[PDB]
Symmetry: D2
Subunit: 259 residues, 4 copies
């Protein structure tokens, strides 16, 4: 079936990509980077993120696979030495698909929407970051600090984790909001705790004075001007992985952070 392969760009990843392609030639696997059904990432989680965003408009017709050439990633959970064994089962099929929820970010001024696999982040364009946080049209708090991070389930082991957020299993269709260095005194008051919102809940950020913010989605971070609203909600779209062996999320957590 149709497939494509992204590479980190170094000698190790490029040479492994050419060997897999030659392995796929020994089957009737057509290379097609326009309409692939199978997307293989080789490198690290950053390389996987690029591959996800490169085909984020055909997520429903693609199964992703990660191969880590550096250290183990959460999305690149295949060592290079298992590449030949990976090629065989890919060519036949008989693999189940697992789906992780995604995060939708709407930015009104027209309006622009983004899909994130890890998280969507807002900071100030210089000076204080002040937003009113609104949950399902309910004013929840006025946040003054460095920024905010809305994380997918599978993103919680990333930036969200460094911000004190909880780690949550990717089968939970939810999103998690964490704070960056909120000021808290008699005047300003934030909840402090991370917040975990379910599907169909809309978290909206509304500016107070400064309307310019630096918003980032996974890799890309672009400065938005004259922002009226930032909306977060669990996406209706989901990223599909091709799984062959059992690699539970919590084992992946153990290997990455404990031993």
């Amino acid at each position: 079936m149709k497939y494509m392969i992204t590479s980190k760009g170094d000698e190790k990843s490029d040479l492994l990509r050419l060997n897999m392609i030659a392995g796929f030639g020994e089957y009737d696997m057509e290379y097609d980077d326009v309409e692939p059904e199978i997307v293989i990432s080789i490198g690290g989680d950053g390389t996987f993120l690029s591959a996800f965003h490169q085909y984020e408009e055909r997520l429903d017709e693609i199964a992703f696979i990660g191969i880590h050439t550096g250290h183990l990633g959460f999305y690149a959970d295949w060592r290079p030495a298992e590449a030949d064994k990976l090629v065989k089962l890919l060519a036949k099929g008989e693999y189940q698909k697992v789906s992780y929820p995604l995060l939708k970010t709407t930015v009104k001024y027209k309006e622009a929407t983004y899909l994130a696999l890890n998280e969507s982040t807002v900071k100030s364009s210089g000076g204080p970051f002040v937003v009113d946080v609104v949950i399902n049209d309910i004013h929840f708090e006025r946040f003054r600090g460095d920024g905010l991070c809305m994380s997918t389930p599978s993103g919680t082991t990333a930036y969200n984790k460094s911000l004190g957020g909880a780690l949550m299993h990717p089968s939970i269709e939810a999103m998690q909001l964490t704070e960056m260095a909120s000021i808290n005194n008699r005047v300003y008051r934030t909840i402090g705790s991370p917040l975990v919102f379910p599907k169909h809940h809309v978290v909206s950020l509304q500016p107070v004075n400064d309307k310019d913010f630096q918003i980032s989605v996974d890799h890309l971070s672009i400065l938005h001007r004259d922002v009226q609203e930032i909306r977060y909600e669990v996406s209706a779209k989901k990223i599909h992985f091709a799984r062959f062996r059992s690699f539970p999320f919590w084992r992946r957590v153990h290997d990455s952070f404990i031993e």
Copy 2:
């Protein structure tokens, strides 16, 4: 319909309970503290917890209602001044039921199971608390510290919150584990972050050396001797509330912690 009313025990709560009963007498509402269908708590969240545990074996046939005589609680979300208006709608009906997930705690040595509305906590009986944490039969970490807290969704605004845990909407069928003062060095390593587990996941705690632990479920805290295993999982049972007005969880959070 059958109903009963629990009181905090002070003058304010006892006198409000007698006035509601007299109000219920003006309807055909039979008082029955053996098989009630409606359980009204008057006082604070602690008073509500007692009422929940008093009838924790008939949760499927009961709708709970909380009235806070002190400050606002998360389960006692009715002011005393709304008691008369509460009596009327209760007697008629035409109220929807909302259900919050619960936490099941199994303690093997026979074996004893408990149901918690807030959280289940383990500490050492004196000296160091050391347990191996196992997730779905996968050894995750060896924890050395003061203890661990497994919190329901609606419990996350309680002890879980003071332990740095995330706050999560009660519609999410999950449980959250937080640490108390874990040591972390070159020898000992814990994840640190709070963990959010979905339904049908079993978190098991297994002793290393000391087998005596102080385990607490909501109010009660009993010392267990010669413990072989502590199992946590999302309960199949759910607590049902009787809701009349709209009081969203996040509004309840706002009122309790922000303003």
Copy 3:
């Protein structure tokens, strides 16, 4: 004696500054914004910071005084209603001076040094912030995250506090380093805890790859290019306050954050 007065710039602060000046005219108090011995700030802590930096090269010959027109600040610990009583004791004298330690920041490429009253902060110019942290010529850790904050004693109630740092009494000649969102896994390892360094200890930050950093000292934040080293140490210079009533630091903390 010679004196000058800085104003926040709004109607309330400007009108109070003109009334104090007229009050000082009723004494032989010469206004001199070039070589003042007494610097009065009117507004908030930000207004005080500006006044400190405006005369940071004559700190040894100046006593500062703060008047908060908005809410209470840590440096502007005088209400406007006490301005007349402040003018009298200032004109006579008979006031003791209290001194708070300061932070010195050296940036080598020549080299530039800065004096901070609150804290000195480093972040990346875009992308990952990676520095090697060196303590008294001892490689301590390789930091990967959003940035670092070195805080004076009296700065610990500011940014340092929002970053989880400890609050410390200003009589302690020390500086405190806190982290912003450090990544921690099997590869990267930071201490996590805030660090409190004594006088004559030199904390040096050394770049790994990217040499561009956004460094901020109190108000000002300037982008530095081709940075070779950032040195932190307790300054030999100290800021002198003019104190009239007893306002202990811990009372100032209580009023600002508790009640």
Copy 4:
């Protein structure tokens, strides 16, 4: 000169203690566990703590030395393989003494005072721990939670660290207070941040309702009944170490927690 040696009690530590004694016999080093001038601990930090408390009434006439048979400790900073080289320099002398500050804890009901090398901890005897915290006779906050930890400088790498406290160099004559799981809402308010107090500052804990508390000093934890006041202050006494090689505190931190 007079000396004694404490052992952890296992085969490795006991056999090393007998070899050092035989090594000391080859000099005119008199063994005297009643009035020793040199106290050698063999085992871990716990073994060192016991040795400190065993002679806590002759601290001014003793230099302590630690040898870690397990992993490296902060006080047992000598490997067993360096025992012979340690014996030689001990017998001659020509070693400088370094002194770490200590913590004094007064418990009034008569009154009992304690000296700690790591920290002094208070918890409730069952149920809620509620104390009013008073700083230099100034009511600072009403604490409701699990407990409080007052840590020496050299204790900050211990329990204090697990409680989010700052790590501070032992040359700083100070003490640090950290919280355990303080509740914080609209009713209850604590500072949250760790607090670092200088010498001659008195932190006093005063009960609200329950007068029974479990107080611990380093190893020992005893239940106190009918407590009227708990006083913390930097002790006037100091523990003296015998140092031979340069082992800076921050290197000791690096080895223990980073690499």
